[PDB]
């Protein structure tokens, strides 16, 4: 629907006022059919729109919702280094060991993208640095050579 399209666009842009006008019990968990089925919460999380993330969560957005590739909004936040968003999602019950269709977890994303504080947050909440994705790679395996601090963090040493 045009309304849902406008809502998804508003979530992506961080347009709080438009989100408030279009967010209904029926649209809060709508999906971008013409993309990868991101929900408003995926868009707000991935584009670091904190106020929108907050509003959506308050109004019943599903923190556990998977997109077409099996990503939850915590994946989006972690891949793009959005620490506050990640913390809000975890506080609202997001599963940290969640795995997409390729068995990538949020820790795989944070590690690969060089996000130390987010890795630390995930580990504090029980994220498993030993979980292999479908390629057989752990999050540690995906750490860039230059990020020796992240390597040490995930090694527990």
């Amino acid at each position: 629907s045009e309304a849902d399209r406008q809502l998804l666009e508003a979530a992506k842009a961080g347009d709080v006022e438009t989100v408030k006008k279009l967010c209904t019990v029926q649209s809060v968990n709508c999906r971008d059919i013409e993309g990868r089925q991101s929900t408003p919460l995926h868009f707000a999380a991935g584009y670091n729109r904190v106020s929108v993330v907050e509003y959506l969560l308050q109004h019943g957005a599903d923190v556990h919702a998977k997109d077409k590739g099996g990503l939850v909004p915590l994946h989006n936040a972690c891949s793009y280094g959005h620490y506050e968003v990640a913390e809000l999602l975890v506080k609202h019950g997001a599963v940290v060991n969640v795995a997409d269709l390729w068995k990538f977890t949020p820790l795989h994303e944070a590690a690969a993208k060089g996000k130390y504080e987010i890795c630390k947050l995930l580990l504090q909440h029980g994220a498993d640095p030993t979980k292999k994705n479908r390629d057989g790679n752990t999050p540690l395996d995906l750490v860039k050579d230059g990020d020796t601090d992240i390597q040490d963090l995930l090694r527990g040493d």
Binding site: G46, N48, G69, N76, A77, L101, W102
Partner: peptide, 13 residues
């Protein structure tokens, strides 16, 4: 099948 990235980006700018 390509694993495409999540919707989003790291820098708002």
């Amino acid at each position: 099948l390509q694993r495409s990235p999540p919707d989003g980006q790291s820098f708002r700018s």
